[PDB]
């Protein structure tokens, strides 16, 4: 089913963007935690 | 200038066109509509955005440079079309020459023949490929489906005798395991490489010979690679630009600096099959979708987008079905 | 059809995660600019 | 100890099981697998994870406590199963007793009978519901589909005469509007409450009467609530733990401190219909999916997962079809 196939593809797109934000979320938090300590 | 630099989507759903006026527009084949339009990021008239590869039908895009030199060699942006926002911004030690994606692996090709392999779920670099570090430019191609398989042209063992050569290397990017090294299939350089969507087949294009060789990709015997077939060039040697493989792997399309677009059939289930006439000094790009094997989508720098039909049993030319015009 | 209904449900969940992470980026950013 | 504290999914796709050994596993029904496995977060042997409610079949989970008291009363974590990361970590002034979710609304129940209502798209608290602030514990239930409808048990206007009572209040959480207030439906306390997936029906369980009453939820006349039917308790009064409503609202399942699981049919389109035998001093949880109306899924703390069939026109017991074993 074509519609089914597009949906599966979007899931991969939405899951990639969220893994990039989570890695950007840990990166930003850590830099904030480092500056505040020092 | 002309509306140059067309880009074609894996699934033949849509294409990328850099309008020389402003930015870069992206259209959609059914129904045809302005899917995405990048805004002004310009300062002079003939400075061009070079590299765009996209996902299948999603909102995720890979964009590279805008300026002639300000931020080109070392940039790669990942943007959502629906919110126009940049997510991750990667930097690379050399100039990008090509970008290919699939559903699992993103490859970035550098000018220094380095190939960067990323797991797309988390953007971790899997392996750095020093091709020129071992021994025109490197031509790379990639499977569309999962079990994505990477194919690149590597130099031969005659670097002492002369500076330039081209053999082929089959690489499984999924496990980062090299599968098969093909010898010099050509006495010349490799101009363009196309890999099948299921990753089982591969074509090779020479600059002098202009004779396409098709090799088995993975299932080929370890002792020696298996050559499938060869195709008649025509009346005149011509440089080849882009090739594509049909979803049932029965059909191969070839386009270039020639008057015509050739169609090759496959013996998996000879010289020439379906030919589409094309205007001479104007460049075109190929594609065909997954719904049917009789429809071939055609992208043109003249402003015209064409959809041709394929004659299964006739050596006659292709038949036009649907057409539309650019912006 | 059933699978499609199920698919729409993961999509709705992922957009919540995307709506939730963007709101943690704005929460974090303001705090970083102050200190 | 035994593998206690089972949790059951809204769509009967999968269930939540706290293995007493390490963490908490979530299995699937078709095909049966280890869907998600939480890692070590322990320090002693008999300290238990209490509350897990999930989405339908997604990666979004609501998890509450690990430690007996270190970070239990005031915690709520939102985790993705495929990447094991915590996204939002909400904190609450009292001890959580239950969490129910749907596709639009997340509810959090406190020990102090406070109910926090959230729009799940942005986690904005819609309304704080001071139940004990107005007049065993409060039992709350919620519709699964959209137009999600909230049902809670509230005290009556006899707080002066005695401390504990239980009436029912129907609440639209979508617009935060109280729909219908039901009177004291019972001469005793309310032990467990179940609401239909479409939000049109509602069940009530008494500790002393042990007679389940069904009322219309929303379409019921404003003048007086409409009682639908009543069901025979059996030979002995027994405490009820969890009830569920079929997708076509024809069937009602009931489990508790009894030897048997009762199945009630509905006259929407009497005393007893289908009974499933159960081991005496062992506790079980119910569910049935949307694919068919003849299959009932069964979760057990003994380690066994069973799938029974329902007899449409016979008053006989259920017939076992498929089974598998826990970890």
UniProtKB/Swiss-Prot annotation, chain A:
Compartments it resides in: Preautophagosomal structure membrane
Lineage: superkingdom: Eukaryota
Function: Stabilizes the ATG5-ATG12 conjugate which is necessary for autophagy. The ATG5-ATG12/ATG16 complex is required for efficient promotion of ATG8-conjugation to phosphatidylethanolamine and ATG8 localization to the pre-autophagosomal structure (PAS). Also recruits ATG3 to the PAS. Involved in endoplasmic reticulum-specific autophagic process and is essential for the survival of cells subjected to severe ER stress.
Subunit and partners: Homodimer. Part of the ATG5-ATG12/ATG16 complex. Several units of each may be present in this complex.
Family: Belongs to the ATG16 family.
Protein name as it appears in the record: Autophagy protein 16
Organism: Eremothecium gossypii (strain ATCC 10895 / CBS 109.51 / FGSC 9923 / NRRL Y-1056)
Residues of the full protein shown: 70 to 107 of 124
Swiss-Prot record, chains B, D:
Record key words, sorted: Autophagy, Cytoplasm, Membrane, Protein transport, Repeat, Transport, Vacuole, WD repeat
GO cellular component, one term: vacuolar membrane
InterPro entries named among the record's database cross-references: PROPPIN, WD40/YVTN_repeat-like_dom_sf, WD40_repeat_dom_sf, WD40_rpt
SUPFAM superfamilies membership: WD40 repeat-like
Origin: domain of life: Eukaryota
Protein's membrane topology: Peripheral membrane protein
Residue stretches of each WD repeat: 185-225, 235-269
Localization (cell): Cytoplasm; Membrane; Vacuole membrane
Short name of any one Pfam family annotated for the protein: PROPPIN
GO BP field: autophagy; protein transport
Renumbered ranges of motif L/FRRG motif: 231-235
Notes concerning its domains: Contains a beta-propeller domain involved in specific binding to phosphatidylinositol 3,5-bisphosphate (PIP2). The L/FRRG motif is essential for the cytoplasm to vacuole transport (Cvt) pathway and for the recruitment of ATG8 and ATG16 to the PAS in nutrient-rich medium and in both its recruitment to and dissociation from the PAS under starvation conditions.
Family designation: Belongs to the WD repeat PROPPIN family.
Functional summary from the UniProt entry: Required for cytoplasm to vacuole transport (Cvt) vesicles formation and mitophagy. Involved in binding of phosphatidylethanolamine to ATG8 and in recruitment of ATG8 and ATG5 to the pre-autophagosomal structure. Protects ATG8 from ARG4-mediated cleavage.
Protein name according to UniProt: Autophagy-related protein 21
